[PDB]
Amino acid sequence: DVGVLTLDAPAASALPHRFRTCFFPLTASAAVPSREGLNGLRVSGSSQFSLAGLALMREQFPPRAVIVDLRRESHGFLGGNAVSWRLPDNQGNPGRDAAFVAEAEAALLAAIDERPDIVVAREARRGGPTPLTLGPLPAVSEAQAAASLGLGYLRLAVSDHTRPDDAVVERFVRFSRSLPPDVWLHFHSRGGAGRTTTFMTLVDMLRNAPSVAFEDIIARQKALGGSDLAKTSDGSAPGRDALARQRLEFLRRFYEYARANPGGAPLGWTAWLAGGA
Amino acid sequence: DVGVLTLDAPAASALPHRFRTCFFPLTASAAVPSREGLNGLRVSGSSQFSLAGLALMREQFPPRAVIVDLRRESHGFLGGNAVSWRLPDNQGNPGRDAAFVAEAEAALLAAIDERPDIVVAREARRGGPTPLTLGPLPAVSEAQAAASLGLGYLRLAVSDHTRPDDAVVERFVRFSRSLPPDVWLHFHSRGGAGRTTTFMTLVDMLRNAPSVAFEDIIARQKALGGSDLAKTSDGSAPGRDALARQRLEFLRRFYEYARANPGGAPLGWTAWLAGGAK
């Protein structure tokens, strides 16, 4: 079961939803959280873009920008349409890393490349419930879409609604430390909500955890246009609540890590974890 | 059998060998070939770089530059060292496409990541014949190395000493057509010779085949610092000669394609071949 081929963004969509940079204004919920260290983060985020949406964003990307794709689920482009293979709760490629995902989704995309009558499901929010019937259209990976615009591309496989695995955190902190000072990171997921806001928060913490309170970092990433990583339901979605609490606990632990290891040094994430009681 | 882990470039290497851009001077072999349309190609090439070499090249890369990695063989970086898995005649991952290769080499790199006493073979040209023992060091794909510098990355799996498969040519022509006018392509292979020079020639033909003779394009990509794609042995290496002849025939056919379809349009490579080449 590879999941239902579903529309993420139609080709006609332009700027993706939940687009924000670290220079965006903060919308107050509560007082406006601290802005200290926010503007200099060289980070932005969004939901999944169409091909046209990526080209539009590129107009305002600095030189040496990187698209950081956080989606563990298989996805790509059919023409300008952003499409993905959706399993229940969007848990595609469960437990798999980016190397496995890239090859799996390459095969899924190859199977719809330049073929007629490809049925693409649409949720109600994206013009559904009637599906689109498309093709022949070129099917490409987001990796190639980014390369075609001269943009960097990094894939990190994070499950929807879920914290990143320790191995992903380790890889990301090492990646962050390898970056020259001019490199900009644009994170995205499907919705630009949980996963995107999680990683913008990690970038925030890697620079600012020694000087800025945990609550301010969480609140300001929400206020910039991200989702609220401190929110849970009233109990109506227990499985989702358990993931949200697991993710918030991880973020508290990462904040402690980033205070003791500014910028991810001297210890990496998993080495730091080995010193716990 | 995944091949012998071998050094491509030591971490201390800086500018890679056979580095050139389409703005470089031409060295005559024969008259200096025509330069018509050469400087505007938005293309460069090199041999395999170290991590330091990539950072150095980035100092002179334009905005929106793409590293186009032509290597079908598995390779990556062990610390700053560029390393690869060499089968006989460097025919790693035979017949496989970039998606397969990326996953295969990711596993090979994971197995040497941050581990001690990794033995890396060295050819005489690359500091050998004594091997190099390295580690613990971070092992990364070139895709990640490129991303860490904010550079684009495209992988096209081409066998050493060989023309690109039709599917690779089709993918590349479509890629070329998709580029906005500011995107710069930096090709590389292992040596910056056959495969890199082939693809710089393809880019040249896509822009200039209607106005510039085939012989001038081949000669100028050599004169810029590439290898000679019109060269063969005297019969002393017949298998390599057969590959070189097959590649040259492909380049003549692509030249005709690019004359009939300037810039890769209206017809693509496979569609042009399917229609009988006009």
Please report residues of B whose CB lies closer than 8 A to that of A144.
Answer: 154, 175
- Which residues partner with B17 through β-bridges? none
Neighbouring residues of B161: CB distance < 8 A, sequence distance ≥ 6: B89, B90, B194, B240, B243, B244
Structure letter (DSSP) for residue A231: -
Please report residues of B whose CB lies closer than 8 A to that of A180.
Answer: 55, 148-150
The answer to whether the beta carbons of residues A100 and A79 sit under 8 Å apart is no
Report d(CA B120, CA B133) in Å as an integer: 6
Report d(CA B206, CA B202) in Å as an integer: 6
Which residue's structure tokens are 């330049």? Answer: A114
**What ranges do the domains of chain B cover?**
11-71+142-274
Report d(CA B204, CA B197) in Å as an integer: 10
Q: Is the dihedral of CA B159, B160, B163, B164 positive or negative?
A: positive
Shortest distance, CA A181 to any CA of chain B (angstroms) = 9
- Which residues partner with A188 through β-bridges? A46, A69
Contact call for B103 and A107, based on CB within 8 A = no
Q: Is the dihedral of CA A61, A64, A70, A73 positive or negative?
A: positive
Structure letter (DSSP) for residue B41: G
Please report residues of B whose CB lies closer than 8 A to that of A114.
Answer: none
Report d(CA A232, CA A245) in Å as an integer: 8
CA-based R_g, chain A, Å: 19
B252 annotated ligand binder: no
Residue A276 CB coordination number (10 Å): 6
Neighbouring residues of A192: CB distance < 8 A, sequence distance ≥ 6: A16, A17, A18, A19, A45, A46, A47, A48, A225, A226
The answer to whether the beta carbons of residues B166 and B79 sit under 8 Å apart is no
Tokens at A186, concatenated: 């644009």
Which residue's structure tokens are 């990976």? Answer: A141
Report d(CA B48, CA B75) in Å as an integer: 10
The tally of CA atoms less than 13 A away on the side-chain side of residue B45 is 28
Structure letter (DSSP) for residue B82: E
Helices A194-208 & A214-223 angle (0-180, nearest 10): 140
The answer to whether the beta carbons of residues A152 and A185 sit under 8 Å apart is no
Contact call for A147 and B107, based on CB within 8 A = no
Tokens at B117, concatenated: 């006493």
Is A14 at the interface with chain B, CB within 8 A? no
Shortest distance, CA B235 to any CA of chain A (angstroms) = 41
- Mutation pick from A68, A100, A137, A151 vs chain B, by most beta carbons of B within 10 Å, is A151
**What SS3 state is found at B39?**
helix
Provide φ and ψ at B238, rounded to 5°: -65, -30
Structure letter (DSSP) for residue A121: B
Which residue's structure tokens are 């490199």? Answer: A183
Residue B166 CB coordination number (10 Å): 12
Question: Given in angstroms, what resolution was this structure solved at?
Answer: 1.6
Residue B225 CB coordination number (10 Å): 23
The answer to whether the beta carbons of residues A236 and A212 sit under 8 Å apart is no
Is A104 at the interface with chain B, CB within 8 A? no
Residue A166 CB coordination number (10 Å): 12
Is A180 at the interface with chain B, CB within 8 A? yes
Report d(CA B38, CA B213) in Å as an integer: 12
Please report residues of B whose CB lies closer than 8 A to that of A93.
Answer: none
The answer to whether the beta carbons of residues B54 and B186 sit under 8 Å apart is no
Which residue's structure tokens are 């395999």? Answer: B48
Report d(CA B214, CA B192) in Å as an integer: 21
Which residue's structure tokens are 């689109």? Answer: A132
Report d(CA A126, CA A162) in Å as an integer: 23
- Which residues partner with B44 through β-bridges? B21, B186
The answer to whether the beta carbons of residues B115 and B121 sit under 8 Å apart is no
Residue B181 CB coordination number (10 Å): 6
**What SS3 state is found at A227?**
coil
Report d(CA B181, CA B87) in Å as an integer: 39
Neighbouring residues of A146: CB distance < 8 A, sequence distance ≥ 6: A54, A67, A152, A153, B152
Of A64, A72, A120, A78, whose CA–CA distance to A97 is shortest?
A: A72
Report how far Cα A102 is from the mean position of its chain's Cα atoms: 16
Report d(CA B77, CA B246) in Å as an integer: 32
Of A21, A63, A26, A69, whose CA–CA distance to A49 is shortest?
A: A69
**What SS3 state is found at B171?**
helix
A191 annotated ligand binder: yes
Report d(CA B218, CA A164) in Å as an integer: 50
Residue A213 CB coordination number (10 Å): 14
Residue B199 CB coordination number (10 Å): 26
Please report residues of A whose CB lies closer than 8 A to that of B147.
Answer: 66, 152-154, 175
Burial of A129 (0-12, 13-18, 19+ CB in 10 A): exposed
Report d(CA A245, CA A256) in Å as an integer: 17
Contact call for A175 and B144, based on CB within 8 A = yes
Q: For A156-205, what is the HEC assignment?
A: EEECCCCCCCHHHHHHHHHHHHHCCCCCEEEEECCCCCHHHHHHHHHHHH
What sections of chain B are H helices per DSSP?
Answer: 51-58, 98-112, 142-148, 166-178, 194-208, 214-223, 238-260, 269-274
Report d(CA A196, CA A191) in Å as an integer: 8
Return the amino acid letter for B193. Answer: A
The region, left, alpha or beta by phi > 0 then psi within -120 to 50, assigned to residue B135 is left
The answer to whether the beta carbons of residues A177 and B146 sit under 8 Å apart is no
Of A221, A250, A186, whose CA–CA distance to B147 is shortest?
A: A186
Of A221, A225, A190, whose CA–CA distance to A38 is shortest?
A: A221
Give the CA distances from residue A224 to residues A15, A190, A276, B58, in Å, rounded to whole numbers and listed in that order: 16, 18, 33, 32
**What SS3 state is found at A90?**
helix
**What SS3 state is found at B33?**
coil
Shortest distance, CA A28 to any CA of chain B (angstroms) = 33
Burial of B207 (0-12, 13-18, 19+ CB in 10 A): buried
Report d(CA B243, CA B252) in Å as an integer: 14
Return the amino acid letter for B171. Answer: R
Is A183 at the interface with chain B, CB within 8 A? yes
Of B99, B119, B94, whose CA–CA distance to B4 is shortest?
A: B119
- Solved how? X-ray
Tokens at A97, concatenated: 């890393």
Please say whether the structural domain B11-71+142-274 has been given the CATH code 3.10.450.40.
no
Which residue in the set B100, B102, B149 is minimally distant from A180, CB to CB? B149
The answer to whether the beta carbons of residues B20 and B46 sit under 8 Å apart is yes
The answer to whether the beta carbons of residues A100 and A87 sit under 8 Å apart is no
Of B129, B173, B120, whose CA–CA distance to B4 is shortest?
A: B120
**What SS3 state is found at A57?**
helix
- Mutation pick from A101, A105, A178 vs chain B, by most beta carbons of B within 10 Å, is A178
Which residue in the set A148, A149, A184 is minimally distant from B150, CB to CB? A184
Contact call for B138 and A55, based on CB within 8 A = no
Q: Give the pairing type, strands B152-158 and B65-71.
A: parallel
Helices A238-260 & A214-223 angle (0-180, nearest 10): 120
Structure letter (DSSP) for residue B255: H
Report d(CA B188, CA B175) in Å as an integer: 16
Give the full edge-to-edge strand order of the sheet including A20-21. A20-21, A43-46, A184-188, A65-71, A152-158
CATH number of A4-263: 3.90.190.10
Q: Is the dihedral of CA A188, B140, A172, A181 positive or negative?
A: negative
Is A156 at the interface with chain B, CB within 8 A? no
Does a cis peptide bond (omega within 30 degrees of 0) precede residue B94? no
